[PDB]
C-alpha cells in the first residue's frame, strides 16, 4: 500500500508535467493565432 | 472598409491566456501538495 | 498513509481543475480560429475576387 | 484504504484519458492553424 | 475565383470540439469517483 | 510587397507539436506506473 499509492503519487506527478507541457503548447499556438489575426488586420487588409 | 473584428478578437485571446495561467496555478497547487505527502 | 491517501485526493482534484481550465481555454481558441477562417472565406476572398 | 486508493487510481486513469483527449484536439487544431497560414501564404498573397 | 476548403475545415473544427468535450466528460467521471 | 513571416511560423508550429508529444509521453509514463 505504501507502494500502490507511491506509484500513484509519482503517476500524478507525471500527469502534472503533461498538463504543463500541453499548456506551453497551447500558449505558443495562441501567439500564432494572434499573429495571423494581426497579419490580416495590419498587413493584408490595407492592401486589399 | 472591411474591418477586422479586432477588439473582440484580442478580448478572446486574452481570455485564452488567462485560462492557461489558471490551469498552471492549479497544477502548481497540486504539485505543492504532492511534495507534501512524504519524500522522493 | 491515511492522511496521504487524502493529500493525493486534493492534488488530483486540483489537477482536474487544471484540465477543465485548459479545456475552456482551448474551446475559446478553437472558436477564434474558426472565426479567422470565416473572415477570410466570407469577407476577404469575395473582395479579393470581384 | 484499499478502495480509497483504488478509487483514486481509477480517477487518475480517467484524468489521463482527459489529457490525451485534449492533446489530440489541440493537435488537430494546430494543423488547421497551419493550414490557414499556408492558405494565406501560398494562395491569398500571390493574388493580392 | 479562389475556393477555400471550408467544408473539411468545419468538419475538423467539429472534431476538435468533440475531443474538448470528451476531455471534460473524462474529468467529470474522475471528479465523480473522487467525490464518492 | 507582401512577405509572410513563414519560417518562424513553421518553427513555432513544430514547437507546438513537440510539446504535444511530450505531453503524450508524460501521460504514457503515468499510465505505466498505474498499471504496475
The angstrom resolution of this structure is 2.3
Question: Solving technique for this entry?
Answer: X-ray
**Total residues found in chain B within this entry:** 40
Neighbors of chain A by Cβ distance (3+ pairs < 8 Å): B, C, D, F
3-class secondary-structure state, position D10: helix
Sorted by sequence, the CB contacts under 8 Å of residue E24 that are 6+ apart come out as C20, C23, D18
Work out the minimum CA distance from D7 to partner chain E, whole angstroms. Answer: 6
How far is the CA of E20 from the CAs of B15, C21, C36, D35, E5, in angstroms?
A: 17, 11, 20, 20, 23
Please report the DSSP string for A1-48 in residue order.
-HHHHHHHHHHHHHHHHHHHHHHHHHHHHHHHHHHHHHHIIIIIHHH-
Q: Is D38 on the interface with E (CB under 8 A)?
A: no
Q: Are D36 and A29 spatial neighbours (Cβ–Cβ below 8 Å)?
A: no
CB contact under 8 A, D30 and F2: no
> D1-48 has which CATH code?
1.20.5.300
Residue C21 near residue B19, CB atoms below 8 Å:
yes
Residue given cell 509514463 in the structure block: F29
Contact, F33 vs A10, CB < 8 A? yes
Domains of chain B: 1-40 (1.20.5.170)
Q: Domain limits of chain A? A: 1-48
- Using CA atoms, how far apart are residues D5 and D11, in angstroms rounded to an integer? 10
CATH architecture of C1-50: Up-down Bundle (1.20)
Q: Which residues of B are less than 8 Å from A33 in CB distance?
A: 13
Amino acid at each position: 500500500l505504501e507502494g500502490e499509492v507511491n506509484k500513484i503519487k509519482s503517476a500524478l506527478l507525471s500527469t502534472n508535467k503533461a498538463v504543463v507541457s500541453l499548456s506551453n503548447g497551447v500558449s505558443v499556438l495562441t501567439s500564432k493565432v494572434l499573429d495571423l489575426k494581426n497579419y490580416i488586420d495590419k498587413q493584408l487588409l490595407p492592401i486589399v | 472598409p472591411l474591418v477586422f473584428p479586432s477588439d473582440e478578437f484580442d478580448a478572446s485571446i486574452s481570455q485564452v491566456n488567462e485560462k492557461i495561467n489558471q490551469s498552471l496555478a492549479f497544477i502548481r497547487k497540486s504539485d505543492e501538495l504532492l511534495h507534501n505527502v512524504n519524500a522522493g
